[PDB]
Design a binder for this molecule. Sequence first.
Ligand code: BCL
Ligand SMILES: COC(C)(C)C/C=C/C(C)=C/C=C/C(C)=C/C=C/C(C)=C/C=C/C=C(C)/C=C/C=C(\C)CC/C=C(\C)CCC=C(C)C
Ligand SMILES: COC(C)(C)C/C=C/C(C)=C/C=C/C(C)=C/C=C/C(C)=C/C=C\C=C(C)\C=C\C=C(/C)CC/C=C(\C)CCC=C(C)C
Ligand SMILES: COC(C)(C)C/C=C/C(C)=C/C=C/C(C)=C/C=C\C(C)=C\C=C\C=C(C)\C=C\C=C(/C)CC/C=C(\C)CCC=C(C)C
Ligand SMILES: COC(C)(C)C\C=C/C(C)=C/C=C/C(C)=C/C=C/C(C)=C/C=C\C=C(C)\C=C/C=C(\C)CC/C=C(\C)CCC=C(C)C
Ligand SMILES: [Fe+2]
Lengths: 254, 281, 52, 52, 52, 52, 52, 52, 43, 43, 43, 43, 43, 42, 304
Amino acid sequence: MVGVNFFGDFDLASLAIWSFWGFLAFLIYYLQTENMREGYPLEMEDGSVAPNQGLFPVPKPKTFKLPNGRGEIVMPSAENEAAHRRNDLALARTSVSEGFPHAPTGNALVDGVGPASWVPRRDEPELDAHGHNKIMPMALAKGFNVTAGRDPRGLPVQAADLEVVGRVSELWVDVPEQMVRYLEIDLNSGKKRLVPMTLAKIWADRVRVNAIASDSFENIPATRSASEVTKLEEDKISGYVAGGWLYDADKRKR
Amino acid sequence: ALLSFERKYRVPGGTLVGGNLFDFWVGPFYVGFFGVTTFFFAALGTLLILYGTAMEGVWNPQLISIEPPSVENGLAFAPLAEGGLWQLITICALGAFISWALREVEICRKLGIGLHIPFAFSFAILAYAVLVVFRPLLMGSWGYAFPYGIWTHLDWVSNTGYTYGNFHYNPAHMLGISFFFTTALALALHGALVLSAANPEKGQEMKTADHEDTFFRDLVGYSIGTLGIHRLGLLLALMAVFWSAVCMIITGTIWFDQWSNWWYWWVELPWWVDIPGGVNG
Amino acid sequence: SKFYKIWQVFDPRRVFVAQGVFLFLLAVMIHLILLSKPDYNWLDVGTAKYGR
Amino acid sequence: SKFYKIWQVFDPRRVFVAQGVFLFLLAVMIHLILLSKPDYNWLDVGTAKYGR
Amino acid sequence: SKFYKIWQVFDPRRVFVAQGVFLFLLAVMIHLILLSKPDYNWLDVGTAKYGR
Amino acid sequence: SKFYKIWQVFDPRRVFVAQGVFLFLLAVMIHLILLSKPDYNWLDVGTAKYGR
Amino acid sequence: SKFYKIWQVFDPRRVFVAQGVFLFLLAVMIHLILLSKPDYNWLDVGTAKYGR
Amino acid sequence: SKFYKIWQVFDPRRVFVAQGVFLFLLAVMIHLILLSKPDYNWLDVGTAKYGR
Amino acid sequence: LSFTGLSDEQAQELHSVYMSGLWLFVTIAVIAHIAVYIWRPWL
Amino acid sequence: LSFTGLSDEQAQELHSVYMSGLWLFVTIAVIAHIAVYIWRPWL
Amino acid sequence: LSFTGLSDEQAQELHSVYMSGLWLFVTIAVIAHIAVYIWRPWL
Amino acid sequence: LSFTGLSDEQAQELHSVYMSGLWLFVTIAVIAHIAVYIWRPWL
Amino acid sequence: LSFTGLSDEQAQELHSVYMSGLWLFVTIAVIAHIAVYIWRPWL
Amino acid sequence: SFTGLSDEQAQELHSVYMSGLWLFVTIAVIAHIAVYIWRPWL
Amino acid sequence: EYQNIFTQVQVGGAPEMGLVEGVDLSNRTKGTTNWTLLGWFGNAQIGPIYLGGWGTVSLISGVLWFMTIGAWFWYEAGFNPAVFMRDLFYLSLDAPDAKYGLGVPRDAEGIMWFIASFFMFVAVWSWWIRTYTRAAALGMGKHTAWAFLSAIWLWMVLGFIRPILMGSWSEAVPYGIFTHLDWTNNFSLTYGNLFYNPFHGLSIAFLYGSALLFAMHGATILAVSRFGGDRELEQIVDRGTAAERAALFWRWTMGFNATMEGIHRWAWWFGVLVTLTGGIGILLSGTVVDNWYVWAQVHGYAPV
Ligand code: BCL
Ligand SMILES: COC(C)(C)C/C=C/C(C)=C/C=C/C(C)=C/C=C/C(C)=C/C=C/C=C(C)/C=C/C=C(\C)CC/C=C(\C)CCC=C(C)C
Ligand SMILES: COC(C)(C)C/C=C/C(C)=C/C=C/C(C)=C/C=C/C(C)=C/C=C\C=C(C)\C=C\C=C(/C)CC/C=C(\C)CCC=C(C)C
Ligand SMILES: COC(C)(C)C/C=C/C(C)=C/C=C/C(C)=C/C=C\C(C)=C\C=C\C=C(C)\C=C\C=C(/C)CC/C=C(\C)CCC=C(C)C
Ligand SMILES: COC(C)(C)C\C=C/C(C)=C/C=C/C(C)=C/C=C/C(C)=C/C=C\C=C(C)\C=C/C=C(\C)CC/C=C(\C)CCC=C(C)C
Ligand SMILES: [Fe+2]
């Protein structure tokens, strides 16, 4: 089939490349549609549905069957967008026109806006396949010990202000994945607060948390329970800590 | 324009240069100092390419080629019809890439996420630079840089390579190829696993990371993990680009002969040199 | 002398393993050196001596 | 007279597996050395002796 | 003798698997070495005997 | 004899599938070897026998 | 005569699939082998026979 | 002098290990660069001295 | 005894059907081979 | 006694039928080898 | 002591069967080698 | 003492039989080397 | 001590056995070197 | 300091270290000047 | 300021042996080793592993393939280990000669290549079935198998399919390190310049896109790992701020974005398309097109 043109210079290779262009167009359509199972329909800064919703249509709902009796999640669904919707946000318009920032009205860390934002996830812990809780304190994880690396437990916690706020007490560990997720801190004020390991750097003599200063460690969201942490609490905590890279920069030193 | 959840994240801050100035959005795009700068540079470079192919008389986008200056011109700025346009386009491309990366920095520090993405982009920027700035400088001319054409920079690839016999025999080239192949393999496998867990067989509940770890352990006896696979692929791509930049920076600056003759030091090792038999004996 | 405490510092397992590997590779290297030379090669030397 | 004690330092299974592998591969390498030389290659020597 | 305690040190099924694999690969090695040599190649030698 | 105790240490499924694949591959390999040799190629031999 | 117990060791839903795949690939391989031969290629030989 | 305090900071095991490795590599390189010297090669020298 | 979860009578049934199918397959193959031999013998 | 858990009776009958099959395979192989040797000897 | 927790009696009968099989394999190999030396020696 | 855990008596037995095997092996190897040296000397 | 935990008695026993083995090894090696020096001197 | 228990054991350890090094280096110099006389390089 | 590239603290307990979802626990091993060097990057648990019929078949066949190649290597070296280690990358079990066409080769090198390739066929397809069944047992999708099938498609095009259409096993790939590089180079040379193959360019586009995409995606997850991004299956059904911040970074950067489920479809497709397009391109070379530069000249992307 060399030099065998159906018409003109059109042989099996041209047929193939044009067929691929078609398949690729269809595939881009499929992928961009499947990327629309979250975040849609589009909104205004006022919260209303926008006149423009896109050039690819939002696809048909699929259903996720959840283990552990947790139910069925439909994507896209108005129920999923309503459950993950923040209400009564503490933000003020910077301008009447669109495309301009929204300014926090109070303490954006406490009010959970901007990089300190959190999503209203379900107030239920993340579970493993057996139905147990995925994140546990290492005391409740039977068999777990520090196989390698530095043990942070007992180390003082230095903040962005270069001041010390307390000492590490316990390690919250992902049991199926065998890794540290949060380290708990005994604050000098008599309170226990969680902090993500990804935002804590273990030195030989200290644990440095440069995100937030000493003022913010006290207002960190607490867990209703001391043995378990919910997805919601996790999101609140991690947002609060991360927001300090912006809202605690004037205090940060060195 | 806004996603259902985008409002609470649209706050002020996260700017390296300018404050209130240039802190706004054009639709979805965030435009700051570096958004402005990269738009300017990108539009100027595009228009320069279009004018260059107009001068040449070529409007088929598959034959457009803006070639560099000659090797005789050296490092000097050439007539715009003889390579100055390539030079301006290269300046604009560098500026646009760097401004894109710094815009990503601004966006990251506005969102509160880590700066891994501009770091990873910097590797590709640096490889492009190795190709059009640094290796030409060490070689003494911009004529060794690749042209801005869809199918002509492939001619540059081929000829640059065959100037050293088969370029397959460069060892850093080998490492780059291996890392690229492994990156593609790992991406395919990661997508496959996440989708197999999230979209399982009809009539079955959604799976967890336990099922993924178990699948890959039953398959090959090891699972690197959810965080490990991401660290791994990131580093794989970065090492691929690093070893490509190495293969090219040494190619006509420290090496000048065919790359196949490099390996003959292990053949000429004085204890098995003259043994008879095999390919080299 | 007082050398016996080297066991109070070193693990006999690891040190014995490394010593064995080292001795073996050293002997291999020496034998291969001797073979590298047309002389001191006992095989070709015997071939010459016995006329085979 | 005291070498029996080594079995308190080393696990017999690991030692035995390593010994087996080492001996087999050593013997193979020596046989291949011999077979690679026209002399000491017992097969060619035998082909010659009986003139076949 | 008392070799039978080799079954007290390590496990039978693993050694049996290893033994099968090893003996098979070794026998194939030897058959192929014999085939590599025009002499001891029983196929071509039989071809030559009966005139074929 | 007592060979029947090999099933007290081997699982029949494993040994059976392994044995099957082993035998199939060995048979295919021997047949291919025979086809590689212009002699013992039963197809060409039959071709020449009947004059075709 | 007690070969029915093979179905007490393997389950048929996988065995039949494996067997069908194996048989199809085997038939394909044999047909291909024969087509590779002008003497047992039935298309070319029918051609030569009927004068076309 | 008062050099006995070097071990208060340094780990004896790691120092000993690195020392051994470095000393062996050093002596190896010395012997090797002598072997490369035609005049100092004790092997070629013993070859020349005697008849062989 | 059984690792798959089948009786002896279940296995007898399964094997009876399997053997009938096998012998059908083999009869077809045998007739085909006889034909080919008569047409172009290889032995 | 048993790593697999099989009884000496189970293993006995299993080895019995196994050897039946092996001897069948070996008999077919021997017949084929005799036929081929008569056809084209190799040793 | 017994790293596989296997007695002396079990290990002893195990070795008995193992060595019986060993000697069978070996004597077949020896017969083959005798024949091979007879039709084409190598030493 | 014993990093492995074995007793002195168990170690003595292990080493006794280990030496038995080693000396049988070296015996076969010595006989083979004598045979070769007679057949084709190397030194 | 705190690096491996042994005691002077244990370490002396271990050094005794070790030096016995080493002296035997080096005696074998010197015998071999002497034989080689006779066969092919290298001074 | 960094070891925490070498304050005095360091004396023992440096003593044995010195003895071993002295043996090593006396052997090494013997060999060196033997080589010098057998073949001198300077 | 901690980039999460390496783990600071390792923890562990009893080994995660696995989940029972349809799996035969008898064919799965019971041995596991933890290795800390891997813990600084990924997980340290080595094992367990499933040992079944398909894996057994694939292991046997692949070991035989490897050993056949190595045996030819030993023959080509004259049984000299020194020449084996000297010429290791230069030795090769080469594809049959053209004189044999497609028939069973009548040479030692050629029949050895044929039988090694038979073993390779068996091993690769057995491993495909292994993947399919290991997913089916855990009630997981077959995406891994359908992805492996694209690589198998290219491997087949190279070794089995295209040699048949072109009419010779000499067109297939030899078993050697440098010889298969030489095969690629000579393939490009024989058919114009393989750069000017459009499907080759597409395969390259998708290869480069795989690295672009994984760099983007891994940098994203490590950037949002502080919010739990690495736990993607829980972000898919219970969206958190990690997914939202990732999506928003990419929307603000380049206008459009994906979901936590939806970027893995991009990943899967960029993966498989490399080998799909490459296989098509290799098929078309020699069978439909003898020169690719002249084809480009005729079809408007090479100057005349
Ligand atoms: C001089 C060289 C020629 C050239 C000639 C070729 C040829 C010829 C081919 C390509 C092919 C490719 N080339 Mg090239 N190539 C050139 C120029 C380039 C340049 C460049 C910048 O210059 C680039 C970036 C590329 C890029 C590529 C890839 C995009 C593509 C192969 C993809 C792949 O993953 O294959 C690798 C993946 C596989 C082979 C799949 C393997 C799957 C199997 C099943 C593996 C099983 C494993 C086995 C059993 C052993 C396992 C071991 C143990 C388990 C550990 N080439 C030049 C022009 N190139 C290939 C292609 O796709 O054609 C279009 C191809 O055949
Ligand atoms: C490349 O240069 C060349 C090769 C040419 C020259 C170099 C040559 C070199 C480097 C040669 C080196 C040779 C060496 C180091 C040889 C060492 C040989 C040894 C140590 C051999 C040991 C053999 C041991 C044997 C055969 C043991 C057999 C044991 C048994 C059968 C049973 C053992 C286990 C039992 C009984 C377990 C009982 C259990 C209980 C609980 C009591
Ligand atoms: C020390 O040495 C020992 C012996 C111990 C072990 C060493 C082994 C060594 C050194 C092995 C080396 C192996 C190497 C270097 C292998 C390299 C392989 C490479 C680079 C292969 C590249 C490409 C191969 C491809 C694409 C193969 C494709 C094959 C197929 C699609 C098979 C299709 C089937 C064919 C051709 C015919 C057979 C089919 C039937 C039905 C009979
Ligand atoms: C590369 O150089 C070449 C290869 C050319 C030359 C050199 C080759 C070399 C050095 C080869 C050396 C080979 C060696 C040393 C082989 C020596 C002996 C071997 C490994 C013999 C083993 C035989 C074992 C067999 C046949 C086992 C048979 C077992 C059975 C029949 C029964 C299996 C177990 C049962 C029934 C269970 C027992 C009872 C209970 C209750 C568990
Ligand atoms: C062509 O020439 C070019 C340009 C290439 C270079 C030319 C000239 C150069 C590069 C000249 C360089 C000269 C230098 C670097 C001079 C100084 C070198 C030194 C300081 C070397 C390094 C180490 C020396 C040491 C460690 C010597 C003795 C040290 C000790 C005994 C201290 C150990 C400490 C103990 C025991 C502390 C115990 C006490 C307590 C309380 C724990
Ligand atoms: Fe992911």
